[PDB]
Homo-oligomer: A and B are copies of this chain.
């Protein structure tokens, strides 16, 4: 009923956002994935197709797409699960969980919740990587998402800064003892974790951020972090990322084959249909169910056929409301005349 696990029957193409910050991409999960591939695979095979949420069937951005079996894989963790004493792996898992949660709610506080930053440094970056009509719709969805992820800290745009610097310390004091990139010192972690940490920190530090409080902390109280970030960027991303095998032409020509005026109009109209007052949520649910079924079919299994009750009910409610509204407006013809006459029975 679209609220349960789905029933079943009985040369990759890494889609990412645009560079947009002086880095190979934005959305530190995307940058993490792209750095991991750049380290692991080689510039011959992957394609780094620039993309958007509505341009993929998973709706999740740092999305690999294999060629041999035509399977979509979303998320950084699933990707690195694909393409593949014990305290090494243990700490790897620990810090992977600790970066995915409690470090992403910081890169939201900066760059997505601070309205002095989301609008002076972010929304330009999103509009610089999207086709024309979309930025009116997608960047706000991304902001709402990162804002919801930013809660459970209790902090928003409201001396209201010393608590913010304390919040940032409460994460960096744990991220500091990792000894990220070194042949000695603290503890080794992993390749796929080191790349994730680079992704997150490099978006914590490198932006321009008109009202910065992460740059100051990370440059004042944490030398090893900024050293790691700068050295990693200068090692695996020389010249800012023009040596990475993007699609046919590079940055802009990558999202050209998948950005015909028809497809872009479809993206826009879907993202706006999901907002109508009553049928919106039901349409979004039916669409998401369809796309998940498509991804699951692609992976190699056969889902349950469909349950069109969602869209049927949404359309039925919309039709009922509008038909009742239109029906009583100039309702049924009148039943009674101007003059009605009775006679005396004889």
Binding site for B on A (CB under 8 A): 115-116, 118-120, 136-137, 140, 157, 210-211, 272, 275-277, 322, 326-327, 329-330, 332-341, 343
Contacts and interface: CB of A to CB of B under 8 A. Distances in A.
Given A210-B341, A211-B341, 13 more contacts: A115-B338, A115-B340, A116-B337, A116-B340, A119-B336, A119-B337, A119-B340, A136-B333, A136-B335, A137-B333, A275-B330, A277-B326, A277-B330
Given A136-B333, A137-B332, A333-B137, A338 B277 contact: no
B120 A341 contact: yes
Nearest to A211: B341
Contacts of A343: 210
Contacts of A116: 337, 339-341
A332 B277 contact: no
12 contacts: A115-B339, A118-B337, A120-B340, A120-B341, A136-B332, A136-B333, A137-B332, A137-B333, A140-B333, A140-B334, A272-B327, A277-B330
Contacts of A119: 336-337, 340
Contacts of A115: 337-340
What does DSSP make chain A's interface, helix, strand, loop or mixed? loop
A155 to B, nearest CB: 15
A157 B332 contact: no
A335 B335 CA distance: 53
Contacts of A275: 330
Contacts of A136: 332-333, 335
Q: Pick the most buried of A115, A322, A336: most chain B CB atoms within 10 A of its CB.
A: A115
Contact of A276 (B326, B335, B336): B326
B120 A338 contact: no
A339 B137 contact: no
Nearest to A117: B341
Contacts of A332: 136-137, 272
A157 B326 contact: no
A337 B327 CA distance: 42
Contacts of A276: 326
Contacts of A327: 272
A339 B210 contact: no
Contacts of A338: 115, 157
A128 to B, nearest CB: 16
Contacts of A272: 327, 332
Nearest to A115: B337
Contact of A339 (B157, B330, B341): B157
A329 B118 contact: no
Contacts of A341: 116, 120, 210-211
A133 to B, nearest CB: 11
A322 to B, nearest CB: 7
B329 A277 contact: yes
Contacts of A277: 326, 329-330
Nearest to A326: B276
Nearest to A323: B276
A340 to B, nearest CB: 6
A326 B327 CA distance: 19
Contacts of A340: 115-116, 119-120
Nearest to A143: B333
A268 to B, nearest CB: 11
